[PDB]
Amino acid sequence: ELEEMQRRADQLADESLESTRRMLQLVEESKDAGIRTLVMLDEQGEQLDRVEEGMNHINQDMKEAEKNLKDLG
Amino acid sequence: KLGKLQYSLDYDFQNNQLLVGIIQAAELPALDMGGTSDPYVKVFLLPDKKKKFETKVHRKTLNPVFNEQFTFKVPYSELGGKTLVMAVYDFDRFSKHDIIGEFKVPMNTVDFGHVTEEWRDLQSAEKEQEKLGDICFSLR
Ligand SMILES: [Mg+2]
Q: Name which of B41, B49, B29, B101 is nearest B67 in CA terms.
A: B41
Which region, left, alpha or beta, applies to residue B27 given φ > 0 means left and ψ of -120 to 50 means alpha?
left
Residues with CB under 5 A from ligand 1 (ion): B 32, 38, 92
When CB atoms are compared, the residue of B13, B80, B111 closest to A9 is B13
Break sites following residues in chain B (C–N > 2.5 A): 127
CA distances from A10 to A47, A65, B13, B18, B80 (A): 56, 81, 8, 16, 18
The residues that bridge with B117 in the sheet, in sequence order, are: B8
Question: What's the 3-state SS for chain B?
Answer: CCCEEEEEEEEECCCCEEEEEEEEEECCCCCCCCCCCCEEEEEEECCCCCCCEECCCCCCCCCCEEEEEEEECCCHHHHCCCCEEEEEEECCCCCCCCEEEEEEECCCCCCCCCCEEEEEECECCCCCCCCCCCCCCCCC
Q: Which residues of B touch A9 (CB under 8 A)?
A: 13-14
Q: Name which of B2, B53, B58 is nearest B26 in CA terms.
A: B2
CA B43 to CA B68: how far, in whole Å? Answer: 11
Q: How far is the CA of B46 from the centre of ligand 1 (A)?
A: 27
CATH superfamily label, B1-127: C2 domain (2.60.40.150)
Q: Say whether B92 counts as a known binding-site residue.
A: yes
Q: How was this structure determined?
A: cryo-EM
CATH class, A1-73 region: mainly alpha
CA B99 to CA B124: how far, in whole Å? Answer: 8
CA B61 to CA B29: how far, in whole Å? Answer: 10
